[PDB]
Amino acid sequence: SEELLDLFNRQVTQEFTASQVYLSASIWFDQNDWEGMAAYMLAESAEEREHGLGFVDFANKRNIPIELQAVPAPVSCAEWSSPEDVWQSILELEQANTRSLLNLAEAASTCHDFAVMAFLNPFHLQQVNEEDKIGSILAKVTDENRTPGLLRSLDVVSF
Amino acid sequence: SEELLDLFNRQVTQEFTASQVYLSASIWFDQNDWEGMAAYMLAESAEEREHGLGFVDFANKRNIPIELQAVPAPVSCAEWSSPEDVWQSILELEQANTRSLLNLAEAASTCHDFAVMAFLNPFHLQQVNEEDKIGSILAKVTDENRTPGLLRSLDVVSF
Amino acid sequence: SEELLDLFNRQVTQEFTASQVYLSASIWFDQNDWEGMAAYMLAESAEEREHGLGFVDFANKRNIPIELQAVPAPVSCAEWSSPEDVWQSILELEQANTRSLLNLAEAASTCHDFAVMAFLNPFHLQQVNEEDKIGSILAKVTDENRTPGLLRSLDVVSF
Amino acid sequence: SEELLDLFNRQVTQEFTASQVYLSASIWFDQNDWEGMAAYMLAESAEEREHGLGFVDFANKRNIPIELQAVPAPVSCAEWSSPEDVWQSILELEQANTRSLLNLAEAASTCHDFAVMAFLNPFHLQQVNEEDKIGSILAKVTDENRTPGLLRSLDVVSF
Amino acid sequence: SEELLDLFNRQVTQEFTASQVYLSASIWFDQNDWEGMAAYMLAESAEEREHGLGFVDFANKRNIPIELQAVPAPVSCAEWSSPEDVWQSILELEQANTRSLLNLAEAASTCHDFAVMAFLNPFHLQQVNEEDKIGSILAKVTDENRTPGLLRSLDVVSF
Ligand SMILES: [Fe+3]
Ligand SMILES: [Fe+3]
Ligand SMILES: [Fe+3]
Ligand SMILES: [Fe+3]
Ligand SMILES: [Fe+3]
Ligand SMILES: [Fe+3]
Ligand SMILES: [Fe+3]
Ligand SMILES: [Fe+3]
Ligand SMILES: [Fe+3]
Ligand SMILES: [Fe+3]
Ligand SMILES: [Fe+3]
Ligand SMILES: [Fe+3]
Ligand SMILES: [Fe+3]
Ligand SMILES: [Fe+3]
Ligand SMILES: [Fe+3]
Ligand SMILES: [Fe+3]
Ligand SMILES: [Fe+3]
Ligand SMILES: [Fe+3]
Ligand SMILES: [Fe+3]
Ligand SMILES: [Fe+3]
Ligand SMILES: [Fe+3]
Ligand SMILES: [Fe+3]
């Protein structure tokens, strides 16, 4: 029961952490002249914040007290050296978003908290979509970067 | 006094110079069947000329006497071999436009010429955007040009 | 600091004084059957008052105490004998508007008051446009008045 | 070859030269408060530059190497004293543009270069119309400047 | 002048011949799955035929007797192995179209046939545009085809 309140607060932190990691990915893309991939990461940064705001709102309604935690500095950017590394980190970030949502559902299920589980259902489906989409972009980015300059042409044309 | 009037006049010449350099870039791109990159240089050539006209207009209003210098012949075209060479020269050109605007601003600041400093503000911000845009284009052109033929795709598809 | 607060209040008084001088010019023109010139002077009166109101509003937001001074009777009217005299006083009123703005900016610069400096930039630019516009009307007025009756045609046709 | 290609280049220089002379006329007119005449010179300035770009564009298509030359400092502004002097230099400039075009056409005829002659036709007709329009303006300006101040109403009303 | 009436007739044959060669080119393109290049050759085939009709129409009005000649079997299809060989034959086709226009204009000039020469003028300018466009396409095709598969995206994306 305390576990439920803890996992809920951690979901908020995880959304906001994802939102900062996305922003760090747009900066890296922008600094390295991948403006289409940057615009994509920027849109994801705003979206992750909207998720965390959606959790905060539900918690206020349900009397789950939210104690906002520190949002840590993203640190992967120190090591990114190609768009491929950035997308790989983004895939790992969404895999962790999926794990924390399942931990939260598990706790809500243990507690028979039907309302929290109903709240979570659209996030579960949305995670399935997002992991698939990022997995597919990573596969494209990886295949295209096998020919010098070719990837640059995707950024420009798509995104 | 003298240094500020001089530099204001020189700014006009620098704008027309850059207009002619963009025209010469447009010619090399056309003669070499890069119509996309040519259309872009041609638009920049008109734009630099409009910058110079804006400086002449302000000088007329502020009674800064303008004397039109000769506009020098562009020199870099005899040595351009690939689009990379052209965008590099264009980057350098814009870096000189920037330094030029800084020197004029510095002379305005010493004279406490608040009107001239205010007039220059939007040009300083525009230079930031311009140097970024050209740096970004140069990085693409340099990356795509590592595969024979791939840069033609950039011109055709996206200019 | 004292200087900047005093100068900022003096700037308000200056704009209202200019508003009354323009009103005085409009009266003289009307009484002397120059209704085109009068209507121009009258739009100028309302505009100077709007400048003084913009300074008042900024001062309220920025906690600069405003103490509204008397607005002195315009005094040039008792000696105006031709439209040339009126336009000449108006040009001098605008040159005096410009210097007070520069002095205020100078005090703002010395105090590192970046907000006040930013607030002043569009007035510096507007004064440039105004002095040029009044200098140019005064040139036309002086030149057309060399033939008896001809200036009367300017008022009717183009104001 | 040789002669034709030379003259074709020189035509582009002539257009840009005229463009700078129009611009210097605009400055003179502005500084001396003839805004109506200055707007017209400024329009011609943009128009002469478009002619030169029409020539560059055709040369690119026809494989006529363009080497862009210095655009000479306009010098007639140092001696202009009144609008008649400016319009008189402008007449002379257009008479030189015309002779310049007739020379080029003469070389094309000699070379049997039918394409170049077809390209030149609308320019010959445009020059006939421009010399006529300028002569007419100069006639009006010379006539009106017989009475002090009267020319000042041409600028204000027309233009 | 038998020479003018013969060359005029030959020009009609030449346009219809070009029409067939273009059709032959679209066939090779289509058979080798270059559908966008194919559509462009087809469009040219129709417009060569229209040029031909335009000559026949003028001739009937000017009383130049037209005797329609055999339109020969296109033969370059036997040699073509890649898109480059096709575009190269198309360039030489247009160079020979230009050349026969120039012979025609020459015979017209000799006869002082002012109406014929006036009739040919837009075709001279059109030929300049065509040779340039084809030059440019062939440069792009040759460049892109330096990487296996790359030319296939030009057909898909740009035709
Ligand atoms: Fe998302
Ligand atoms: Fe999304
Ligand atoms: Fe999320
Ligand atoms: Fe997400
Ligand atoms: Fe997404
Ligand atoms: Fe620009
Ligand atoms: Fe510029
Ligand atoms: Fe620029
Ligand atoms: Fe730009
Ligand atoms: Fe005003
Ligand atoms: Fe105003
Ligand atoms: Fe004011
Ligand atoms: Fe004012
Ligand atoms: Fe005004
Ligand atoms: Fe015109
Ligand atoms: Fe011209
Ligand atoms: Fe002209
Ligand atoms: Fe004109
Ligand atoms: Fe065609
Ligand atoms: Fe044809
Ligand atoms: Fe054709
Ligand atoms: Fe075509």
Numbering used by the authors:
A (entry chain B), B (entry chain C), C (entry chain A), D (entry chain H), E (entry chain E): 1 to 159
Q: What wording appears in the published article?
A:
A novel ferritin was recently found in Pseudo-nitzschia multiseries (PmFTN), a marine pennate diatom that plays a major role in global primary production and carbon sequestration into the deep ocean. The structures confirm the typical ferritin arrangement: 24 subunits assemble to form a hollow spherical shell.
To determine whether occupation of ferroxidase sites and site C is time-dependent, apo-PmFTN crystals were soaked for 5 min, 45 min, 4 h, and overnight in 2 mm ferrous sulfate. The latter two sites may serve as the nucleation site for formation of the mineral core. The iron in site A is coordinated by the conserved residues Glu-15, Glu-48, and His-51. Coordination of the iron bound in site B is by 2–3 glutamate residues, depending on the subunit. A bridging oxygen atom is modeled between sites A and B and between sites B and C. In addition to Glu-130, the site C iron is coordinated by Glu-47 and Glu-44. In the PmFTN structure soaked aerobically for more than 4 h, Glu-130 is a ligand to iron atoms in sites B and C. In contrast, in the earlier PmFTN structure soaked in iron for 10 min by Marchetti et al., the iron in site C is coordinated by only Glu-44.
